[PDB]
Symmetry: C2
Subunit: 162 residues, 2 copies
């Protein structure tokens, strides 16, 4: 029964590792065709984590809200940050989101108006949002030069499940 236990342990590892979403007790028991008890499953996970600690692996399995998933050790948090969220990427993401937020709330709104509310540089967020179909022109403001006013799109609403 040692081998069977080890093979079952290997199967859990492969499933949790392959998962593109936290995997629960129900899913793991159905696929391994093993009637895992909540306590038995956690015990198997503990053993794997013990082996990771033993062999010097940089990741661990975590039980988050009933779903197990791998996470890298806090020791490499800075490195992971530079990979998943480098500064420049964060700047682009933040700026697009903030401008989008201003449009969502103040629409119909002009570039000049968005600038006033934000107090920016300004930048190319409007062009980026238009190129992605998240905002569109709603008309022209009644002000000097009749600047274009923007509003969010059904494309934006559908995507964000509003």
């Amino acid at each position: 029964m040692q081998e069977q236990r080890q093979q079952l342990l290997r199967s859990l590892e492969a499933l949790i590792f392959s998962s593109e979403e936290p995997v629960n007790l129900q899913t793991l028991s159905q696929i391994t065709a093993h009637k895992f008890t909540p306590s038995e499953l956690q015990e198997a996970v503990d053993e794997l984590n013990r082996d990771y600690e033993a062999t010097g692996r940089t990741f661990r399995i975590h039980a988050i809200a009933g779903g197990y998933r791998f996470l890298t050790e806090p020791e490499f948090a800075d490195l992971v940050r530079q990979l998943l969220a480098p500064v420049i990427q964060r700047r682009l993401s933040r700026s697009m989101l903030e401008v989008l937020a201003v449009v969502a709330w103040h629409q119909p709104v002009t570039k000049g108006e968005i600038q006033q509310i934000r107090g920016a540089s300004p930048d190319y967020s409007i062009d980026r949002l238009l190129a992605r179909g998240l905002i569109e022109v709603r008309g022209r403001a009644d002000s000097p030069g009749r600047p274009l006013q923007y509003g969010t799109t059904e494309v934006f609403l559908d995507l964000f499940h509003l």
Copy 2:
């Protein structure tokens, strides 16, 4: 040639009206199989807008950056706002976007931390963003109670073309 002109005018209306995107001179000339000059096209559009004014229609064709599209008259701007962007919808949209923005910039970040930065109520923005796959857990903070930290997802990045 009156009938041909009128039929061509009707075709332009139908195309511009059906468009789910501003339609340019190139597209309109290819579909109507008519070699429109930039001046001739604007003149046809002016005639249609004259008929809209004459019959009391609530919309007009506008030339925005080389693309023509229908827009409703400013006289009904308030009504249109209540339809396309009612207050409650705007609140949901803004809150989700602002929290998303805070995560994009401050990740990995906890709910407590997001609250501090925003100075909110708080709300259910994190749950909403998790349910949409835009954010995910990155680990647990080194603070009392070890609260979950969040970060954006490749799903978010791919969707926003980062």
